[PDB]
């Protein structure tokens, strides 16, 4: 996943 | 003005450059790598510095900005809780500040276990939870406090004071007034508990790697950074430590993401201005 | 002892  | 647009623009410029340099490269020798098939990072873009990591299986770092020593970490994954609890115990944690909202914890997809508001068993560790006081921080924001008792056969039982702010949404910044009150409550809590270990002649008072306040939100880079930055300014020993110093030190000791939103850096800038603290160096 | 920190 990417927290951005 | 030391806090005018020109100064604010300069600071951001330096910070931006730093964040890009600390960008994690594939199999970067500066960041902790997942050894085996166990997931370490909650996010592939939010990594943990190797030379300041607490444990090899947790995404957490020892952080020291000025004379303020703390521990920043990501919200523990389901499978890291056992190791997370041992870290809290061993550290003789004087205070645990959790900045993740209740809404995020409830969201089952976010994979954030509610490990501090309820009692439970995790591997060899037994945790008991008990709700204590509730402190108003302002702007309707509340701090819910608990006490976590960590038990593990063969180890000394350790209780940890917990401060949970449930209404602080991610990627947002609370007012500087609130942040200042929240920083005070955490230091007071830590101060009270630390005093206990000293009256007991604990061996942690001599270890600079222990008795450190542990703080985390979800990724441990946005909301966590704001509080830490605020805690430094509370410390009466960090005289002359600039805003540039703070953020720099946080990013170099964890990752270039520390202090994500600009709205968050703005709160720090505002607090510094109220103290006449310098923004830039030299 | 075991609980000397409680």
């Amino acid at each position: 996943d990417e927290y951005l | 003005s030391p806090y005018g647009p020109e100064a604010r623009a300069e600071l951001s410029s330096r910070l931006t450059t730093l964040r890009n340099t600390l960008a994690p490269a594939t199999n970067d020798p500066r960041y902790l790598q997942a050894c085996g098939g166990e997931k370490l990072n909650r996010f592939r873009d939010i990594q943990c510095r190797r030379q300041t990591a607490v444990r090899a299986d947790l995404n957490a770092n020892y952080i020291q900005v000025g004379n303020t020593r703390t521990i920043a970490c990501q919200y523990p994954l389901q499978s890291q809780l056992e190791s997370h609890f041992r870290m809290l115990a061993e550290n003789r944690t004087p205070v645990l500040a959790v900045l993740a909202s209740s809404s995020e914890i409830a969201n089952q997809r976010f994979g954030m276990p509610d490990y501090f508001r309820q009692s439970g068993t995790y591997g060899s560790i037994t945790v008991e939870s008990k709700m204590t006081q509730q402190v108003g921080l302002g702007d309707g924001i509340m701090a819910d406090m608990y006490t976590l008792t960590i038990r593990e056969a063969g180890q000394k039982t350790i209780s940890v004071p917990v401060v949970h702010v449930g209404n602080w949404p991610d990627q947002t910044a609370v007012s500087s007034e609130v942040t200042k009150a929240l920083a005070s409550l955490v230091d007071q809590t830590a101060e009270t508990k630390r005093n206990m270990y000293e009256s007991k002649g604990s061996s942690a008072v001599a270890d600079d790697s222990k008795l450190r306040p542990v703080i985390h939100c979800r990724a441990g880079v946005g909301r966590t950074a704001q509080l830490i930055g605020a805690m430094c300014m509370n410390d009466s020993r960090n005289s002359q430590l600039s805003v540039e110093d703070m953020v720099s030190q946080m990013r170099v000791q964890r990752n270039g993401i520390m202090v994500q939103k600009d709205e968050q850096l703005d709160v720090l800038i505002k607090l510094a201005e109220g103290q006449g603290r310098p923004l830039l160096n030299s």
Side-chain angles (χ1 to χ4, degrees), chain A, chain B:
Chain A
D1 210 70
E2 280 182 353
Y3 182 57
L4 189 125
Chain B
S1 177
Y3 313 85
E6 37 285 309
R8 298 164 179 278
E10 179 56 47
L11 173 63
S12 300
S13 175
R14 299 180 189 178
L15 297 173
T16 301
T17 301
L18 193 65
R19 170 186 277 178
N20 300 337
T21 298
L22 303 178
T26 308
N27 204 67
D28 205 306
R30 299 176 293 174
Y31 294 103
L32 251 184
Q33 296 302 307
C35 52
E38 257 288 286
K39 188 173 181 179
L40 174 68
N41 305 318
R42 182 175 221 74
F43 306 100
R44 50 178 303 296
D45 48 316
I46 299 293
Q47 290 177 43
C48 178
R49 256 272 193 171
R50 195 193 301 283
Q51 37 278 76
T52 55
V54 179
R55 304 169 78 83
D57 61 343
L58 288 181
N59 184 293
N61 292 100
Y62 280 112
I63 297 185
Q64 183 180 319
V65 22
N67 291 291
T68 302
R69 305 175 175 68
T70 57
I71 287 180
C73 59
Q74 55 170 28
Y75 199 110
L77 287 166
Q78 177 73 279
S79 62
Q80 300 174 323
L81 290 182
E82 197 171 330
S83 195
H84 182 71
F85 282 123
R86 280 163 187 157
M87 189 262 281
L88 294 180
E90 281 184 50
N91 177 56
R92 296 282 185 273
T93 308
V95 70
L96 171 68
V98 180
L99 310 174
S101 63
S102 294
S103 310
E104 295 179 71
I105 290 168
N107 186 314
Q108 208 59 195
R109 270 177 290 103
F110 288 177
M112 295 156 77
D114 189 352
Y115 73 91
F116 60 89
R117 287 181 300 173
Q118 68 173 315
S119 304
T121 294
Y122 312 87
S124 308
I125 297 177
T126 289
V127 181
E128 199 206 309
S129 173
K130 52 198 75 65
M131 170 155 219
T132 58
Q133 359 158 12
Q134 300 198 53
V135 176
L137 298 173
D139 295 335
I141 294 170
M142 276 274 277
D144 287 332
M145 284 175 281
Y146 305 77
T147 299
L148 278 170
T149 305
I150 311 172
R151 265 175 282 259
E152 177 171 13
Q155 305 293 296
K156 287 161 175 288
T157 301
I158 297 299
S159 53
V160 179
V162 180
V163 176
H164 176 208
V165 178
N167 33 47
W168 183 351
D170 67 81
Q171 298 210 60
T172 77
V174 297
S175 68
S176 70
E177 198 206 15
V178 174
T179 306
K180 189 161 70 288
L182 174 58
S184 290
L185 184 58
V186 177
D187 286 335
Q188 267 143 55
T189 298
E191 198 68 287
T192 297
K193 185 71 181 185
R194 175 183 279 91
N195 179 61
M196 185 283 294
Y197 286 111
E198 287 201 53
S199 75
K200 305 271 199 194
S202 177
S203 64
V205 297
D207 193 349
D208 265 309
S209 63
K210 299 181 170 177
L211 256 44
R212 291 181 175 225
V214 183
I215 302 143
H216 80 65
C217 39
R218 191 186 175 186
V221 299
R223 289 164 284 180
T224 294
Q226 196 172 304
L227 175 49
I228 293 176
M231 290 173 78
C232 292
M233 310 214 225
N234 240 198
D235 201 312
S236 52
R237 297 177 297 164
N238 298 322
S239 324
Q240 300 313 303
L241 179 72
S242 63
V243 162
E244 191 185 329
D245 285 319
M246 292 190 263
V247 182
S248 290
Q249 295 181 285
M250 282 194 264
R251 292 183 175 185
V252 181
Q253 293 172 63
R254 183 155 165 66
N255 67 51
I257 314 298
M258 291 305 277
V259 184
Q260 188 207 62
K261 307 288 298 184
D262 284 304
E263 288 77 8
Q264 305 175 310
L265 175 69
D266 275 355
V267 175
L268 297 177
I269 291 180
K270 187 181 177 301
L271 293 178
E273 187 179 307
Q275 292 189 300
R277 180 182 301 282
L279 291 183
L280 295 162
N281 288 326
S282 180

